[PDB]
Amino acid sequence: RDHWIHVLVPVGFVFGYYLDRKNDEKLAAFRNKSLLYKRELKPQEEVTWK
Amino acid sequence: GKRLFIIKPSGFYDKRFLKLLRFYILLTGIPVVIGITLINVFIGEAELAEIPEGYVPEHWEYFKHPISRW
Amino acid sequence: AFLPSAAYLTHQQKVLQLYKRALRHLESRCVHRDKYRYFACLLRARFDEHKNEKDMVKATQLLREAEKEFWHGQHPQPYIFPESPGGTSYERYECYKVPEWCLDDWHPSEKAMYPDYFAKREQWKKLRRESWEREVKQLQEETPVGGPRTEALPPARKQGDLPPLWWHIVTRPRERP
Amino acid sequence: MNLFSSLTLVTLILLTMPIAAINFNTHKFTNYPLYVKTTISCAFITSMIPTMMFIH
Amino acid sequence: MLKYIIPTMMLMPLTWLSKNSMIWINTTLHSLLISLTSLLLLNQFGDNSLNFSLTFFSDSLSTPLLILTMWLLPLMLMASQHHLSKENLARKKLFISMLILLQLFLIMTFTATELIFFYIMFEATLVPTLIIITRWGNQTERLNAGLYFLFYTLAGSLPLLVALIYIQNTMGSLNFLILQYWVQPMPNSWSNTFMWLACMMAFMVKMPLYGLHLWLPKAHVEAPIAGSMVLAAILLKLGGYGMMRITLLLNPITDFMAYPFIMLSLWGMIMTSSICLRQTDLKSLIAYSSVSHMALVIVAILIQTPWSYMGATALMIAHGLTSSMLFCLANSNYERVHSRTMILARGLQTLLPLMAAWWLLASLTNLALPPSINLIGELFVVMSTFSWSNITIILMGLNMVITALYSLYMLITTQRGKHTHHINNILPSFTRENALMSLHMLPLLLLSLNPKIILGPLY
Amino acid sequence: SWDKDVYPEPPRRTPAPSPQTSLPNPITYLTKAFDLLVDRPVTLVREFIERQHAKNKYYYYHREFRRVPDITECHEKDVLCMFEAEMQWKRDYKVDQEIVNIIQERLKACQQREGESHRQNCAKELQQFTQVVKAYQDRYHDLGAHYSARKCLAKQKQRMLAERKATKEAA
Amino acid sequence: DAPPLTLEGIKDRVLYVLKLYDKIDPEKLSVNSHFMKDLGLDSLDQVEIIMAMEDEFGFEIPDIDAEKLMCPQEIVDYIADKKDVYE
Amino acid sequence: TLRWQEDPEPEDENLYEKNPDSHGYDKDPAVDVWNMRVVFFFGFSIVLVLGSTFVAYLPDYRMQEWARREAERLVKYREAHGLPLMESNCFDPSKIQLPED
Numbered sequence A: 001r002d003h004w005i006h007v008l009v010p011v012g013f014v015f016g017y018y019l020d021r022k023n024d025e026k027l028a029a030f031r032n033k034s035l036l037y038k039r040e041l042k043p044q045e046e047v048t049w050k
Numbered sequence B: 001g002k003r004l005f006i007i008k009p010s011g012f013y014d015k016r017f018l019k020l021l022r023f024y025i026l027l028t029g030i031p032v033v034i035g036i037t038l039i040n041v042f043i044g045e046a047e048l049a050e051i052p053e054g055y056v057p058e059h060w061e062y063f064k065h066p067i068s069r070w
Numbered sequence C: 001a002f003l004p005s006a007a008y009l010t011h012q013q014k015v016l017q018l019y020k021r022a023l024r025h026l027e028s029r030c031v032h033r034d035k036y037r038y039f040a041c042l043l044r045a046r047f048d049e050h051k052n053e054k055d056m057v058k059a060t061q062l063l064r065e066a067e068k069e070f071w072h073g074q075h076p077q078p079y080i081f082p083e084s085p086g087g088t089s090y091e092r093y094e095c096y097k098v099p100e101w102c103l104d105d106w107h108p109s110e111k112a113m114y115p116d117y118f119a120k121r122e123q124w125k126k127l128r129r130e131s132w133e134r135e136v137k138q139l140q141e142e143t144p145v146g147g148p149r150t151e152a153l154p155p156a157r158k159q160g161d162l163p164p165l166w167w168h169i170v171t172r173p174r175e176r177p
Numbered sequence D: 001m002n003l004f005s006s007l008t009l010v011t012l013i014l015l016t017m018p019i020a021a022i023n024f025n026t027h028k029f030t031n032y033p034l035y036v037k038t039t040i041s042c043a044f045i046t047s048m049i050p051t052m053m054f055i056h
Numbered sequence E: 001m002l003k004y005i006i007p008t009m010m011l012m013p014l015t016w017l018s019k020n021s022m023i024w025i026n027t028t029l030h031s032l033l034i035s036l037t038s039l040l041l042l043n044q045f046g047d048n049s050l051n052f053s054l055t056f057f058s059d060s061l062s063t064p065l066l067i068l069t070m071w072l073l074p075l076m077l078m079a080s081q082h083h084l085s086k087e088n089l090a091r092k093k094l095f096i097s098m099l100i101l102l103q104l105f106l107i108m109t110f111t112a113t114e115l116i117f118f119y120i121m122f123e124a125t126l127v128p129t130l131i132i133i134t135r136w137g138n139q140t141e142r143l144n145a146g147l148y149f150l151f152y153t154l155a156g157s158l159p160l161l162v163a164l165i166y167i168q169n170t171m172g173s174l175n176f177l178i179l180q181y182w183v184q185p186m187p188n189s190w191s192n193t194f195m196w197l198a199c200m201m202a203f204m205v206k207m208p209l210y211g212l213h214l215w216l217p218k219a220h221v222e223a224p225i226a227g228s229m230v231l232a233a234i235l236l237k238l239g240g241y242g243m244m245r246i247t248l249l250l251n252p253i254t255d256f257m258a259y260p261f262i263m264l265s266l267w268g269m270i271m272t273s274s275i276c277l278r279q280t281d282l283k284s285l286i287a288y289s290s291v292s293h294m295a296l297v298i299v300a301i302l303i304q305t306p307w308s309y310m311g312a313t314a315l316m317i318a319h320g321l322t323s324s325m326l327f328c329l330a331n332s333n334y335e336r337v338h339s340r341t342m343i344l345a346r347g348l349q350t351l352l353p354l355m356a357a358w359w360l361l362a363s364l365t366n367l368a369l370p371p372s373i374n375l376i377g378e379l380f381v382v383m384s385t386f387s388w389s390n391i392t393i394i395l396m397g398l399n400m401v402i403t404a405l406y407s408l409y410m411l412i413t414t415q416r417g418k419h420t421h422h423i424n425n426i427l428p429s430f431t432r433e434n435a436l437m438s439l440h441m442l443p444l445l446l447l448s449l450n451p452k453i454i455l456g457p458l459y
Numbered sequence F: 001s002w003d004k005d006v007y008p009e010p011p012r013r014t015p016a017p018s019p020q021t022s023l024p025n026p027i028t029y030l031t032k033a034f035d036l037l038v039d040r041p042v043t044l045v046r047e048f049i050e051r052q053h054a055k056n057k058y059y060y061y062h063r064e065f066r067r068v069p070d071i072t073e074c075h076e077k078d079v080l081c082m083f084e085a086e087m088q089w090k091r092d093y094k095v096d097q098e099i100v101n102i103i104q105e106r107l108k109a110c111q112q113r114e115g116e117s118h119r120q121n122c123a124k125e126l127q128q129f130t131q132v133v134k135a136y137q138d139r140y141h142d143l144g145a146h147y148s149a150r151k152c153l154a155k156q157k158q159r160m161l162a163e164r165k166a167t168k169e170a171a
Numbered sequence G: 001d002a003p004p005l006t007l008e009g010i011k012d013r014v015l016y017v018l019k020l021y022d023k024i025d026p027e028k029l030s031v032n033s034h035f036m037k038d039l040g041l042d043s044l045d046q047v048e049i050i051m052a053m054e055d056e057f058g059f060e061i062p063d064i065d066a067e068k069l070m071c072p073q074e075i076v077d078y079i080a081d082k083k084d085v086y087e
Numbered sequence H: 001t002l003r004w005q006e007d008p009e010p011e012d013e014n015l016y017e018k019n020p021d022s023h024g025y026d027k028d029p030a031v032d033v034w035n036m037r038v039v040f041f042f043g044f045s046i047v048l049v050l051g052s053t054f055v056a057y058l059p060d061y062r063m064q065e066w067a068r069r070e071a072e073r074l075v076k077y078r079e080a081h082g083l084p085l086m087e088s089n090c091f092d093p094s095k096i097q098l099p100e101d
Helices: A005-027 B012-042 C011-029 C033-049 C056-072 C100-105 C116-140 D002-023 D031-056 E004-017 E023-041 E062-077 E088-109 E113-123 E128-136 E142-171 E175-182 E191-204 E216-222 E225-233 E237-247 E260-265 E270-276 E282-303 E305-337 E353-366 E373-388 E394-414 E431-447 F027-057 F079-120 F122-139 F149-169 G008-016 G045-055 G072-083 H027-058 H061-078
Strands: none
Touching: A005 C100, A005 E004, A005 E023, A005 F079, B012 E353, B012 E431, B012 F027, B012 H027, C011 C033, C011 E088, C011 E282, C011 E394, C011 G045, C033 G045, C056 E270, C100 C116, C116 E191, D002 D031, D031 E305, E004 E023, E004 E088, E023 E088, E023 H027, E062 E088, E062 E237, E062 E305, E062 E431, E088 E113, E088 E128, E113 E128, E113 E142, E113 E237, E128 E225, E142 E216, E175 F079, E191 E237, E216 E225, E225 E237, E225 E282, E225 F027, E225 F079, E237 E282, E237 E305, E260 E270, E260 E282, E260 E394, E270 E282, E270 E394, E282 E305, E282 E373, E282 E394, E305 E353, E305 E373, E305 E431, E305 G008, E353 E394, E353 E431, E373 E394, E373 H027, E394 H027, F079 F122, F079 H061, F122 F149, G008 G045
8 A cells, every 4th residue: 555654543543442432341330320320221221321 | 008017025825825725614614504504494403391201311312403412 | 414425514514404494494483475585584684694704613603503593493393394204294105115026026927917027127137137246346446445435336437337236226116106 | 673673783794794705805806995885874774774763 | 531642642653654755744634633533522511520531531621721732733743844844854753753742741741630640741741842942943042941941840840749749648649539529728837838839839930930930031932933832832831730730739828828929920920021022032022921921820820719710721722822823923034034133124014914914913812802812811810810909900900001012012013114125035925824824823713702612610 | 482480571561653743754664664575584484494393303301410418418538429419519509600690680681671760660680689699609609719519518617607606695 | 186297397397496586597597507606696595496496396305415406407307316207 | 264164054945936836835846735735624624614613513511501491490499489599508507517615
């Protein structure tokens, strides 16, 4: 490819964006446990947020 | 008759910059304005209503304009 | 006391300048023309009374006393011509006096609108660059050693050449461009 | 009530229109001072109407 | 916050593997892409801040600074590509890498929830800035300027490190949210007095405070254009941000301990402003104007009222934009005439009309013309200081004269009058310079339409 | 539209036009031209837009917050409960700011509507404004830029201590 | 406004105001007539002549150039230089 | 006096001589035009216009207007039951234990 270098910055965003999502999986200790948003789970809803 | 030569600095480059700036602003300004007008005319804004019993809404359903919800 | 031609001002020059400014101030005080004529002829008689004075120190004392008289008798706001310094429209059009070298920075697209003018400009620049070395070689051989003693410039001596340092006094912008 | 506010803000918007007209210019304007003078005279009429309404 | 750090650190392979003719295009394109990406930090809530992880967070104070930094990097890339056109390729890539490293350090300094991480990268911002100033500065005095800047900063900020470690040992944590919920009042003692001084003096130097400002009219002058942008538009605001963060823990000693420093700014912003009336140097004039504006910011922070805090945020953003634009205009004039003195080149409106229009608009935004955000910040600080005391309005009002008294003065001698006869290399304005001016100014006037996004976290 | 109980307005009383001259006033002719040339196309365009909006309907809701225990029943240096208490306090603070804004808007509307008899006909609005300003000042003033629920609780405790002491002096 | 000037026009003007002087015979002077040499005038009369020039053409001649103009053609040349005539 | 070997200072280059259509970005004309196009496209038509559209349509920034709606509820409650429009105490004074003195 003559100009493959122009994928260096965008995909480095996307993978980096994905990393932030993984951090949410490490911070779900109080998911559907906060006193303000404690709510019974809807049918066919395993989690309130991902 | 008897017209003289009015000596002035070259205004070609500044006029070229202004033309380029207006063109590059308008090139995406016209599509976004058309998009906002089409959103507001056809799809339109939401209508405020009370929360139905046993139904919880999404977070993006708490806002009025379609672009804000999006 | 600050002149490009002479180092100093002679006594007659001081008397003439005093007569000029005194007549101008009297014209300012005496707006109507006939009254101005009366007092201008009176001032002319007063200047002509001591015309044939041979004692230099007496003439100098009379000059100093006349300066004191004039400074006591000024108009607080005298008449200034509109284009003279201090006037209403002095240096008004200096925003319009664009120097000609900006024409060298013109685009070829706008240079095509004036073909004959730019041909004449090219031949003028050719004449300047043809005569510049002749002008400077005249300048080195004319002035004495130790630098010029006066700001006056020599003219074009020989035939077929131009006076030295002429470009910025010929191509100067017009008063009303 | 509806004629009043509409005509007053029309006077204001009509006054601010030629600024955008000259700022969005490309060519040499065909006697822009005449355009500005006509705009201001029309705005004078448009502001004369609610002054008459206030007088009434 | 990983979605902005990773592309910024991937900009270095982008600028190190590019061709010898397309480094500027690629770097400007991708930094503009990152500036567009930066708008996703506006998800702010009226009660809670935006917390990403244990390491990074961003409330409504850091967000305008982050957007300004990642918008400012492409502007430096476009500005600093003319005096480096003849430079060697490797040194060009090293300069771009220094700019990229400086942006990375800044945008992770503004988001650190823990205070010692903030200190570490607040001092990591020293190295690329100093390298740029002492390497690509022009004249002899860049070395002395770099020494002055580095030593003022470090000698002011080592006791800040000592105090922060003492806070970590005493309170038990340095996280800003924990400190927000575990803050204890500081009683009256000499130990607490020197605690306040150690916490404050680093930001006092970096603000700069009057009497500690001697490193500004050197480092803002000998540095190149991109160095001038970062020196006037982020780092001073970085000191202000640190001051806003660390004034939380120093209550209620501040209610008297801020008493001298306010005076040191309240008189100080007079004197430096008067210096701009009698400055023979354009860059020095802009630097002393920056001193005066940041002294006004210092007073606003020290009186600690809500209106003063929103005024300080708006003032910091607006002053960063205006100072960067003014430095760009002065650098364009210096490139054209090859001297920095203000009186050499006169009457440039006859030759450069559109750049004269940009000069007029920048000067108008400098003297706080309404409804610009400069006037909004200045006004809010004025209201808060009038609530603080009455006679302060005099110290405001006189300043409101003197500011204009230099700004229009800066407008006259550089643009009005009869032009210099012997200077005949005044080329017409490039598209690059005009694009740089428009990209500096149009966000400011657009921010005048919706200012509520820069009015601080307590808006 | 808006709700008239929150934003009160008196029923208007418009006099009938009873002219005493024969010259026709231009106001009536210009008004008739206004509903001819302006109101009809504007209303037609709005009718078309309203039909297009009635073709595609969807709703949005006002977010409701349940009550979390406040800072008075929160253990000290227990961030898990104090965080929720402080969030509730800040939400309440913003709501009270908008309430005071509503009362200020009421006062300005009363003054403009009454015109030249505003200092007699707007006594109730001024009294409501004074009451809400007094309560806001006693609730939220002099906290600083670093305001929190603990500072508000300390200010309220000091105010109740001063009130109890002043009662004890005059008892 | 501001009608154009010409060399023969300004020459006619300076001669026309010169024959209205009671110290000068109109049947003797020409365009190369010196004042104190060919006409027997005085230096003060030259000063009055220069002030008449200023009041005629509406612009003031500076003194350091007023002390040098000695013939009507010299005044014509100075006015032509100062007004940029015959473009 | 003899002095060291040193290149003289080069003359100042003009970009308009070899390229009268130069935009001032680079000496290469194609690189010049492409740099100008990249700057004008990604600066004005990508960040500025779309950023203004994004900021103009922010979804209820800082909950601000929401509080207004909540006020339009609360007063509607507190003007209907005869309650005071605003209490002078933030918390309930019953559940506060003052120190004895």
